[PDB]
Amino acid sequence: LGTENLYFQSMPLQLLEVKARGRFGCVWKAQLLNEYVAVKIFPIQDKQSWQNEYEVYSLPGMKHENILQFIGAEKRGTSVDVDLWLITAFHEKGSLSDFLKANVVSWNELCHIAETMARGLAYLHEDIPGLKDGHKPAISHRDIKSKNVLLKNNLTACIADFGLALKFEAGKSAGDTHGQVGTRRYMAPEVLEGAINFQRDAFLRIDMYAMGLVLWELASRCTAADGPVDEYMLPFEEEIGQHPSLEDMQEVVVHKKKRPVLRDYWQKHAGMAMLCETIEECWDHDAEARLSAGCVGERITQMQR
Ligand SMILES: c1cc(-c2cnn3cc(-c4ccc(OCCN5CCCCC5)cc4)cnc23)ccn1
């Protein structure tokens, strides 16, 4: 009964269903022309995050198999009644979190998700001069988690949601983050302590800590374990549940120095053993001790052998 369309850049669009709840907007599955897309709608009060994500996607070189594909962004409506839209590709399998909740992964499936994920993060982190669109800066994501990794039909991963992302220009100090912070559960101990004056490398190391946790999520659901695979739980859920306070997290991560358990039986398999070692180095309390994104990709290659 739907002959009426919305229009985006003169093209017809129909909203289907709200599929996800962002930190900062709701995400709709929609049809634009003859393809499905995602329309992320932010209220006007979250203009800063919309603007940030738009700016990040506007940087040179921000098209890559392992970065969620940008389509466009626009302010909508009347200056009285405003919404902000950001349109990306749509991925029907959803986030790595959604998938791991419904499925176990084989070793080969895990390796593919991890390799593609680590490739996207490493690209995001890389400063690359000489692109046709300009000079790509290093970009920290600042909210790495399984819910921000989307899977394609073949389980290829891409990094999504750049509302908190921060670029670095090699002749300037790290710009203003406007008081906004990532998901508590995935926060590095230095972030939880309330440390300040973070600069580029500190921000990258914060991403790599969160990445360790995502890599644990995969490990935790992999059938290469020499024993049973438990039901999916978020990092730290076993210890502090689904809805932790900042103080809950400080206690578990900062004061007790605990991490999600890497079970010894997971490490019979040579590869899983290297995976667990890699995870441990990613989430080290010492930020300086943590692997780079490029190093993690090296390890995942080494792992596949
Ligand atoms: C963040 C995310 C996105 C985004 C792009 N695609 N996309 C897809 C989803 C999503 C899609 C499907 C979801 O359903 C749950 C899993 N289903 C269950 C039924 C069988 C298929 C898999 C849940 C979430 C969420 N967000 C996005 C766009 C912009 N910013």
Residue numbers in the entry: -10 to 0, 191 to 484
Task: Provide text from the study.
Within this complex, the constitutively active kinase of the type II receptor activates by transphosphorylation the kinase domain of the type I receptor. Here, we report that dorsomorphin and LDN-193189 activities, even within the TGF-β family, are not restricted to type I receptors but extend also to the type II receptors ActRIIA and ActRIIB.
Crystals were obtained of ActRIIA with dorsomorphin, from which the complex structure was determined to 2.0 Å resolution with two protein molecules in the asymmetric unit and clear electron density for the bound ligand. The structure represents the first reported of the ActRIIA kinase domain and reveals an active conformation with high similarity to that of ActRIIB (root mean square deviation of 0.9 Å over 289 Cα atoms). The high affinity binding of dorsomorphin is characterized by a single hydrogen bond to the hinge residue His-270 as well as a hydrogen bond from the pendant pyridine to the catalytic β3-strand residue Lys-219, which is also positioned to form the typical salt bridge with the αC residue Glu-232. Overall, the binding mode is highly conserved with that observed in ALK2. However, in the inactive ALK2 structure, the salt bridge between the catalytic β3 lysine and αC glutamate is broken, and the pyridine nitrogen of dorsomorphin instead forms a water-mediated hydrogen bond to Glu-248 (αC). The binding interactions of ActRIIB are predicted to be similar to ActRIIA, with which the ATP pocket residues are strictly conserved. The strong binding of dorsomorphin to ActRIIA is additionally demonstrated by our co-crystal structure with the ActRIIA kinase domain as well as by our Tm shift and ITC assay data using both ActRIIA and ActRIIB.
